[PDB]
UniProtKB/Swiss-Prot annotation:
Presence of the UniProt keyword Nuclease in the record: no
First and last residues shown, out of full length: 87 to 748 of 831
A Gene Ontology molecular function term of the record: retromer complex binding
Source species of the chain: Homo sapiens (Human)
Oligomeric form and interacting partners: Interacts with LPL and SLC2A4. Interacts with the cytosolic adapter proteins GGA1 and GGA2. Interacts with numerous ligands including the receptor-associated protein LRPAP1/RAP, GM2A and NTS. Forms a complex with NGFR which binds specifically to the precursor forms of NGFB (proNGFB) and BDNF (proBDNF). Interacts with the Trk receptors NTRK1, NTRK2 and NTRK3; may regulate their anterograde axonal transport and signaling. Interacts with CLN5. Interacts with PSAP.
Induction: During osteoblast differentiation.
UniProt function note: Functions as a sorting receptor in the Golgi compartment and as a clearance receptor on the cell surface. Required for protein transport from the Golgi apparatus to the lysosomes by a pathway that is independent of the mannose-6-phosphate receptor (M6PR). Lysosomal proteins bind specifically to the receptor in the Golgi apparatus and the resulting receptor-ligand complex is transported to an acidic prelysosomal compartment where the low pH mediates the dissociation of the complex.
Name of this chain's protein: Sortilin
GO biological process, one term: endosome to lysosome transport
């Protein structure tokens, strides 16, 4: 750390706020972007019949947590149900809805709602009792939907002032795009009893009119531009996926295996181009298979086998590395029952082990002391109570930066982990810090901050202005705190960070927060001179196709490590793409085709088995005619190879084995 006079530039920018009360469960919510508004909520028991034996305390900051004001009187100390949480409005709507507990015998529930970033609240009594949290229509923050304790679907067009029940007997409801609502309904019995017999409904006018877009429904889900629905198989207790890209007007069967009741589907990630779908393996395995879709969400390539996804807790380590296009990391179960971290750079086209740091030696999990990989601690390691304070961290505005606890060896080890960092989207790695730490990225990567994870109280904070290569430590208080967590504005564009914890026992361990402003550390604004040209996904500069991923390269401007300046709240990631010539690698095999060990070419399958044969017989005829190739979704290559073969019909092939009637 080459920062000069850093103590003097941070001492006057460190703002302590001690919460005198705040006893118990503490909920913290940010309200909007570029507002600095933070709500802190706590609830507790009181021996007052008049309060139904409960009260809340509610604090509000509007300077990114430097100072808080007690605004409990705005909700009349009413006990707030924290299971619902604070219902925070989209982007800068400033909408806030708290769900109160009401006494016995009430007609319906009660909410406290604010439309001005919690400066004023109004009380609203509901014609129903809410069963779920209230969901904002993403397009319009005035439109809300909620299920009632009677499984009624209620909608409000005026930010919860007035509600109407648009349908009864609803199991699950979700906002689509353009203020569209999808929901399932039950008939004879309960939602569980009518599984595989539910109906899937749609309404695009907030309940004025309805359309039934699916029958024999098990459940449904949304991902990217795709609507997925699981439907029964009439003869038995199994189900399969159908997909729609037109909000349920038309459907097609997904080329994915059917599953039983004790299996599950899980959308790992989805966008405008494709979806990552996990299919649980039959049996108590704790793993499944990742499948990647084509751009229609219909034809699926098998991407990764033995993908870890436990039933107990639903723990998976699948992580979109949001700081570099096409990069995803996850954990796989080897045959040896060990857990290995895998990384893909091309959207699940190929997976490989993570390259270990050059200066790192292998741990006891590796047979060879000098040959091993880097493995990453994520949700599963945390769920298993390993000493992992945080999961991997990446931000799209901090190009290439990835931070995670890990271990260098042949499998995820149980030892107390170090923190490792990548600046190139996961191609190369360095040990960032020794031991576990909480970490946060500020100013689009202009500053990285770390807090040591310790059993004893701490009073120091580590910061780096060169993407984690050099560090300096700042004592932010003379009264050490038992650290609990960091709070910083979502989007990693602020220069404010809030350190939360409680003081030592002799001080009644009240909650306290230290908010630090790094504006005097990054006093100078970045200029053009402080940015440098960087080709993403570079592995060999002498190669003409170096950096081509899904058919194109991207060349960035990014902040020089030696440059100590502020990117700014308005910082924009600058990148330019180079359109590579198409090769066979830019195409996936269409239905009825596969790739042999021989490179590139998609060849006709000899016989269609399992779900492939079920797709052929029952699939839509349009998808059953192809030449064997489809452009990879999101692939922008131009020129070069184009498949010569014309459109061959694959359904005659599967039906040819069956004797047909007249
Ligand atoms: C993995 O994470 C990356 C980064 O978060 C995801 O890329 C992001 O995808 C979203 C949705 O497709 C993009 O938002 C869109 O931006 C365009 C602007 O061109 C806007 O017009 C759209 O309305 C939409 O808001 C976002 O820009 C994009 N971010 C980057 C850096 O490319 C990616 O989708 C994730 N992978 C999967 C499988 O979900
Ligand atoms: C760090 O926190 C301060 C709050 O103390 C933020 O200050 C705000 O800055 C914006 C933009 O300059 C002003 O419009 C607001 O009036 C400021 N708020 C206050 C209370 O003065 C500051 O923006 C934060 N730093 C970053 C990078 O977001
Ligand atoms: C979390 N997974 C699920 O809720 C699930 C499941 O296991 N089967 N269908 N769905 C609904 C999801 C849609 C992809 C059909
Ligand atoms: C709080 O109590 C006052 C006084 O009884 C009442 O007027 C008000 O409606 C209540 N609710 C809110 C949100 O102020």
């Amino acid at each position: 750390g080459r920062v000069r006079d850093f103590v003097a530039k941070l001492a006057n920018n460190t703002h302590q706020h001690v919460f005198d009360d705040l006893r118990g469960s503490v909920s913290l919510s940010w309200v909007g972007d570029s507002t600095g508004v933070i709500l802190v909520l706590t609830t507790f028991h009181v021996p007052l019949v008049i309060m139904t034996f409960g009260q809340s305390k509610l604090y509000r900051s509007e300077d990114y947590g430097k100072n808080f004001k007690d605004i409990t009187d705005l909700i009349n100390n009413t006990f707030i149900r924290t299971e619902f949480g604070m219902a925070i409005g989209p982007e800068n709507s400033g909408k806030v809805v708290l769900t109160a507990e009401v006494s016995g015998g009430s007609r319906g529930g009660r909410i406290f709602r604010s439309s001005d970033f919690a400066k004023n609240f109004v009380q609203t009594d509901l014609p129903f009792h809410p069963l779920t949290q209230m969901m904002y229509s993403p397009q319009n923050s005035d439109y809300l939907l909620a299920l009632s304790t009677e499984n009624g679907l209620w909608v409000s067009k005026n930010f919860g002032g007035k509600w109407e029940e648009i349908h009864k007997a609803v199991c699950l409801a979700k906002w689509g795009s353009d203020n569209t609502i999808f929901f399932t309904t039950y008939a004879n019995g309960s939602c569980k009893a009518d599984l595989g017999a539910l109906e899937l409904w749609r309404t695009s006018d907030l309940g004025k009119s309805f359309k039934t877009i699916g029958v024999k429904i098990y459940s449904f889900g949304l991902g990217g531009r795709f609507l997925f629905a699981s439907v029964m198989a009439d003869k038995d207790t199994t189900r399969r996926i159908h997909v729609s890209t037109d909000q349920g007007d038309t459907w097609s069967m997904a080329q994915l295996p059917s599953v039983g009741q004790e299996q599950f589907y899980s959308i790992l990630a989805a966008n405008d181009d494709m979806v990552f779908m996990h299919v649980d393996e039959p049996g108590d395995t704790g793993f499944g298979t990742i499948f990647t879709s084509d751009d229609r969400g219909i034809v699926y390539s098998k991407s990764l086998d033995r993908h870890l996804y436990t039933t107990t807790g639903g723990e998976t380590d699948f992580t979109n590395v949001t700081s570099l296009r096409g990069v995803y990391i996850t954990s796989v179960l080897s045959e040896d029952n060990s857990i290995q971290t895998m990384i893909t750079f091309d959207q699940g086209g190929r997976w490989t082990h993570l390259r270990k740091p050059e200066n790192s030696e292998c741990d006891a999990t590796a047979k060879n002391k000098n040959e091993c990989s880097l493995h990453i601690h994520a949700s599963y390691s945390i769920s298993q109570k390993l000493n992992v304070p945080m999961a991997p961290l990446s931000e799209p505005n901090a190009v290439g930066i990835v931070i995670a606890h890990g271990s260098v060896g042949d499998a995820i080890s149980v030892m107390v982990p170090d923190v490792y960092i990548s600046d190139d989207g996961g191609y190369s790695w360095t040990k960032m810090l020794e031991g576990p730490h909480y970490y946060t990225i500020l100013d689009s990567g202009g500053i990285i901050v770390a807090i040591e994870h310790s059993s004893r109280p701490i009073n120091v904070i580590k910061f780096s202005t060169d993407e984690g290569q050099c560090w300096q430590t700042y004592t932010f208080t003379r009264d050490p705190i038992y650290f609990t967590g960091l709070a910083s504005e979502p989007g990693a564009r602020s220069m404010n960070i809030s350190i939360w914890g409680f003081t030592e026992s002799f001080l009644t361990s009240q909650w306290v927060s230290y908010t630090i402003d790094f504006k005097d550390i990054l006093e100078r604004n970045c200029e053009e001179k402080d940015y440098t040209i960087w080709l993403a996904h570079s592995t060999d500069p002498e190669d003409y196709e170096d950096g081509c991923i899904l058919g194109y390269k991207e060349q960035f401007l990014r902040l020089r490590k030696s440059s100590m300046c502020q990117n700014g709240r308005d910082y924009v990631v600058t990148k330019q793409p180079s359109i590579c010539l198409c090769s066979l690698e830019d195409f996936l095999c269409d239905f009825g085709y596969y790739r042999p060990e021989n490179d590139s070419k998609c060849v006709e399958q000899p016989e269609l088995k399992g779900h492939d044969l079920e797709f052929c017989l029952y699939g839509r005829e349009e998808h059953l005619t192809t030449n064997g190739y489809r452009k990879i979704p999101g692939d922008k290559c131009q020129g070069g190879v184009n498949p010569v073969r014309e459109v061959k019909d694959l359904k005659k092939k599967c039906t040819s084995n069956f004797l047909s009637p007249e």
